């Protein structure tokens, strides 16, 4: 029933029981300098950054290296190009990056206060500038969508200069095979910061890699822990009553150290690019006044695919939506991308085989009941679908209802939630987007490329 085969794991062997000395608990972060575009575009850089033993890499002066005009992301330029669109803010307590104090200011805690409100780019910019002029609570403009191709064209054009595996869109990027928009993952988000502005502890959605460029003028301080330790960090969150996957928490560094967890700590200067490898747990605080831009990428590695599918299944256990629809993505990749890595090939092939089996069983049960199934094929830029009630991905066979609102709009449900409503599926239209033979031939057409 799982889309993963445990036997196929490529996770690195790490023995948490081996006690580590202070030195190994404070490892250095890999810090690369690129001299030429040739080096930035080398497959060797892709291999270096995605190696499962390398959780986070900083690529020093990458902006000047490739002649990226990061001034196009200055606050002044952004304001001039913006409209009145609403953006969101987090209000936080300004505190040292290694600290997070309880209300009485007597002890360190994990839960981290970070409340939501809304503003505009231009009004947040006035706050950022007034902060810098000195004219304690702070505000952080976060997850600002730079997705409008027209409004943000010069900005987005500058990012086309990055090496392919870092780009927002690329054929070696799983997120570019979603076929619909996931704002901030396969589109750019902007972060406008004052000193103290925090992005609290997390793994990326579905454990996808992340790219972050600091525009400046200030620095950002980063903290990171290898994927391997994530369950131990989750246990701290639970101990302190904050949700690991969806809550706002800031680790106590000595808790991680006591638990034998190495923590990477480094400073990201203006023009530096941080590559966050798959599954790396990280948190970030602005040291100065700066803007960052960031998005996700899913390079075609077995480690990435495994960690994305593992989180997909864990989200299902925890009743948390996976905003990357991994079954849909897996078939799209299989149909359109040559996979030469034998580990990654075996994993995708295994996932597709389970998906075919499920769809076949589902279809045979419907046919046995005499339930009409209509074909509604895929079309360009069509989204992937999820159950309205339980938020699981619903792939291929769709159980849709128009009962509420207009009889011409339908909500999608999984089989389970559809059958809980009307056990005879009365009033449920069943669609299939891929005929049995379309999936069979896509599966057979998917073979290991040399």
């Amino acid at each position: 029933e799982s889309y993963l085969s445990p036997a196929q794991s490529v996770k690195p062997k790490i023995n948490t029981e081996e006690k580590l000395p202070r030195e190994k608990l404070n490892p250095p972060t890999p810090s690369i300098y690129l001299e030429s575009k040739r080096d930035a575009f080398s497959p060797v850089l892709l291999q270096f950054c995605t190696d499962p033993r390398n959780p986070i890499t900083v690529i020093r002066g990458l902006a000047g290296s490739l002649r990226l005009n990061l001034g196009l992301f200055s606050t002044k330029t952004l304001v001039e190009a913006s409209g009145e669109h609403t953006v969101e803010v987090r209000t936080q307590v300004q505190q040292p990056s290694d600290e997070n104090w309880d209300l009485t200011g007597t002890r360190q805690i994990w839960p981290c206060e970070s409340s939501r409100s809304h503003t505009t780019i231009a009004k947040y910019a006035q706050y950022q500038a007034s902060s810098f002029q000195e004219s304690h609570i702070i505000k952080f403009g976060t997850n600002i969508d730079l997705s409008d191709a027209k409004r943000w064209k010069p900005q987005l054009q500058e990012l086309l200069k990055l090496p392919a595996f870092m780009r927002v869109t690329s054929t070696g990027n799983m997120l570019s095979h979603v076929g619909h928009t996931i704002l901030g993952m396969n589109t750019v988000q902007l972060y406008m910061k004052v000193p103290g502005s925090r992005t609290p502890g997390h793994q990326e959605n579905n454990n996808f890699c992340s790219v972050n460029i600091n525009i400046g003028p200030g620095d950002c301080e980063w903290f990171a822990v290898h994927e391997h330790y994530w369950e131990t960090i989750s246990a701290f969150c639970d101990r302190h009553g904050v949700d690991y996957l969806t809550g706002s928490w800031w680790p106590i560094l000595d808790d991680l150290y006591a638990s034998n967890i190495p923590v990477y700590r480094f400073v990201q200067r203006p023009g530096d690019l941080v590559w966050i490898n798959a599954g790396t747990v990280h948190w970030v605080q602005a040291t100065g006044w700066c803007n960052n831009i960031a998005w996700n990428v899913g390079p075609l590695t077995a480690y990435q695919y495994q960690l994305a599918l593992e989180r997909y299944e864990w989200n299902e256990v925890k009743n948390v939506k996976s905003i990357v629809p991994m079954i849909h993505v897996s078939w799209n990749v299989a149909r359109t991308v040559k996979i030469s890595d034998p580990d990654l090939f075996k994993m995708i092939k295994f996932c597709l085989l389970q998906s075919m089996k499920h769809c076949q069983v589902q279809r045979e049960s419907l046919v046995r009941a005499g339930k009409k199934i209509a074909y509604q094929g895929r079309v360009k830029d069509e989204p992937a679908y999820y159950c309205n009630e339980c938020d699981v991905e619903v792939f291929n066979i769709l159980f849709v209802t128009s009962e509420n609102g207009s009889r011409n709009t339908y909500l999608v449900h999984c089989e389970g939630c559809a059958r809980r409503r009307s056990a005879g599926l009365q009033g449920v239209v069943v669609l299939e987007q891929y005929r049995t033979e379309e999936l069979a031939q896509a599966y057979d057409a998917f073979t290991l490329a040399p």
Partner: peptide, 17 residues
């Protein structure tokens, strides 16, 4: 063909309170 509705997918930082 019939119009199927979807929830927009977006990354957004955690928020308290």
């Amino acid at each position: 063909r019939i119009q199927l509705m979807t929830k927009a997918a977006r990354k957004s930082a955690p928020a308290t309170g």
